[PDB]
């Protein structure tokens, strides 16, 4: 019995961007998430499949942490059954999603006076992201009928597209930390449970 | 409509940490307006800003009263309060609480602005 | 800094077109949004133009912004100088670390 490592995943100093999301299996520990409260009031706490009341009381085989940084305008994009730019070539929640989205503002931190260039997402690409799927490729996007052959020709755009993030941005241009807890809930086994 | 109010001692002696409560009402300390902000104006003397904080408890500071500017937010009781630490004879000034829209592109628009109290800091 | 630097008074016949200057010593002026707030003598201040070209509603259209980024400044010229207008007029911006500075203050005087 011990306590998991939800706050050395929400503490985190630096974060991955939304192309890059970086993914933490949470087994073989007390899942007590009451600690998720002490930090400040969240910008958007949905639960899906599960009760943001009684999540100390009920058992989770797989715990899943998924971490990235997004746009404002774009959190209402990471839910279960979504349409946007960030749900299709960035990060695609599945339709039958169990867990809970806990995003809160983060513009004293991923924010700089000359711009930060560090959290870049995907503008475009040949199809949509899968459920849980990860792309970090970089190679140039071809849109015309023309090879592009790995330059940036007339009709040639880069698949990465940097956000600005600066402080002075409006709060749907400010940057959120996005913690999405993936609950894979008792389906064969019983490990993760939390304190009894 | 919205309406700002401050409150507090009206005087505080030097050395002393000066503290001013402003009461929003008609509208939260929440996703209405995202800011909050102090302005004191010395009598005979231009505005000078002092620090607006966020609910999400994103504080941002004037450069020259960092170490004395501290703000905290009470959404319980749509009340932030200001406290400046370490007063000195040149803080005799009206201090006003006007929300910010951050809701555009970027930060502007000091719309609502409150009536200002002054406090002087001698005993 | 984003320190702006506003003259200390202007005067000129009503009727007439006033300009005041709102010049900014460092940073770039087109970067931040510039505001202009009416504080009259024993009041509070109230925005007259917002966003450097949109005015709100209730504010006669003698007030009118705009942004000269080949001299890094502002200018808020009047058109039909009245005594109504004679309050103090600051311009504020904000620097690129989140800090909101506001000017100096313009002593308006009505000559007539």
């Known amino acids: 019995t011990n306590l998991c490592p939800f706050h050395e995943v929400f503490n985190a100093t630096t974060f991955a961007s939304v192309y890059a999301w970086n993914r933490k299996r949470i087994s073989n520990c007390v899942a007590d998430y009451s600690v998720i409260y002490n930090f400040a009031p969240f910008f958007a706490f949905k639960c899906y499949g599960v009760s943001p009341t009684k999540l100390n009381d009920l058992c989770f085989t797989n715990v899943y942490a998924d971490s990235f940084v997004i746009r404002g305008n774009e959190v209402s994009q990471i839910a279960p059954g979504q349409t946007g730019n960030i749900a299709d070539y960035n990060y695609k929640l599945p339709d039958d999603f169990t867990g809970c989205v806990i995003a809160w503002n983060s513009n004293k931190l991923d924010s700089k006076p000359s711009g930060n260039y560090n959290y870049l997402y995907r503008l475009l690409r040949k199809s949509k992201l899968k459920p849980f799927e990860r792309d970090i490729s970089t190679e140039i996007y071809q849109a015309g009928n023309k090879p592009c052959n790995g330059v940036a020709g007339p009709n040639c755009y880069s698949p990465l597209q940097s956000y600005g993030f600066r402080p002075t941005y409006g709060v749907g241009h400010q940057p959120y930390r996005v913690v999405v807890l993936s609950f894979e809930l008792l389906h064969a086994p019983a490990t993760v449970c939390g304190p009894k | 409509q919205v309406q700002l109010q401050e409150s507090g001692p009206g005087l505080v002696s030097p050395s002393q940490t000066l503290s001013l409560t402003c009461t929003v009402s008609?509208?939260?300390?929440?996703?209405?307006?995202?800011?909050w902000s102090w302005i004191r104006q010395p009598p005979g003397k231009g505005l000078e800003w002092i620090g607006y904080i966020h609910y999400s408890g994103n504080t941002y500071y004037n450069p020259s009263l960092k170490s004395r500017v501290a703000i905290s937010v009470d959404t319980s009781k749509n009340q932030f309060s200001l406290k400046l630490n370490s007063v000195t004879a040149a803080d005799t000034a009206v201090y006003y609480c006007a929300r910010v829209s951050v809701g555009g592109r970027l930060v502007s628009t000091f719309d609502y602005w409150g009536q200002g109290t002054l406090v002087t800091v001698a005993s | 800094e984003f320190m702006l630097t506003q003259p200390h008074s202007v005067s000129e016949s009503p009727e007439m077109t006033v300009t005041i200057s709102c010049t900014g010593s460092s940073g770039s002026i087109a970067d931040n949004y510039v505001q202009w707030y009416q504080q009259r003598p024993g009041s509070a201040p109230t925005t007259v133009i917002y966003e450097n070209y949109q005015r709100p509603s209730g504010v006669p259209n003698r007030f009118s912004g705009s942004i000269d980024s080949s001299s890094n400044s502002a200018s808020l010229t009047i058109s039909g100088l009245k005594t109504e207008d004679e309050a103090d007029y600051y311009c504020?911006?904000?620097?690129?670390?989140?800090?909101?500075?506001f000017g100096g203050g313009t002593q308006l005087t009505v000559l007539g």
């Open positions: 008609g509208g939260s300390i929440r996703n209405e307006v995202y800011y």
């Open positions: 504020q911006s904000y620097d690129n670390s989140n800090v909101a500075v």
